[PDB]
């Protein structure tokens, strides 16, 4: 049900990522490098386990999860969170919880592009990824 999300994706547009990072308490120097970084996101499946890799010249991350089953995660900015990823309205919705805080990472396909919407506090960031062959 997730299959159109699978593959290798490259960042091609970013709006309000600094706002999002600052809301999370990321320091200025990290925000500065991150603002010029273009990650590659690789989404693969093996049975109902999904692996999501984010690779860049700055930070790399990898998570594996079953849809609808909570997992522990340590984010790129070193938050230790309780996470769950589900399909909702055809969107891949990743909710992270820690210290009573929450943030959502929502992925939706629009005209073949992967749109990642990141919300924390009032900050709303929209990052667009395009498929690599
Ligand atoms: C792994 C590369 C992530 C993007 C560059 C480094 C950012 C580090 C500080 C902010 C981390 C916030 C949580 C992760 C944001 C992921 C954004 C994305 O996948 O495009």
Residue numbers in the entry: 0 to 132
Share the article's original sentences:
To further confirm that chain-length selectivity is determined by the FABP3 structure, five SFAs (C10:0–C18:0) with higher affinity were cocrystallized with the protein and analyzed by X-ray diffraction at cryogenic temperature, which resulted in their crystal structures with ultrahigh resolution. As reported by Sacchettini’s group, these SFAs were firmly held at their carboxyl moieties by cationic residues. The side chains of two highly conserved hydrophobic amino acids (Phe16 and Ala75) closely interacted with FA molecules in the C7–C9 segment, responsible for the higher affinity for FAs longer than C8. In contrast to the structures of proteins that possess a flexible binding pocket to accommodate a wide variety of ligands such as cytochrome P450 and nuclear hormone receptors, those of the FABP3 cavity incorporating different SFAs were virtually identical with the main chain RMSD of 0.13 Å and the conformations of the C1–C10 portion of the FAs were also very similar. The water molecules in Cluster 1, which were highly ordered, formed a stable hydrogen-bonding network that was virtually identical in all five FA/FABP3 complexes. On the other hand, Cluster 2 was confined to an unstable (high-energy) hydrophobic area surrounded by nonpolar amino acids and the FA hydrocarbon chain; a significant desolvation energy release was expected from the displacement of water molecules with an alkyl chain. It should be noted that the C18:0 chain almost exactly followed the high-energy hydration sites. The lower affinity of the C20–C24 SFAs could be accounted for by the highly ordered water molecules, which contact with C18 FA at the top part of Cluster 1. Further elongation of the FA tail should disrupt the stable water network, thus destabilizing the binding of longer FAs. Formation of this network is effected by the carboxylate at the FA head group, suggesting that a U-shaped FA in the binding pocket of FABP3, in which the tail comes close to the head, is the ultimate design for defining the preferred length of FA chains.
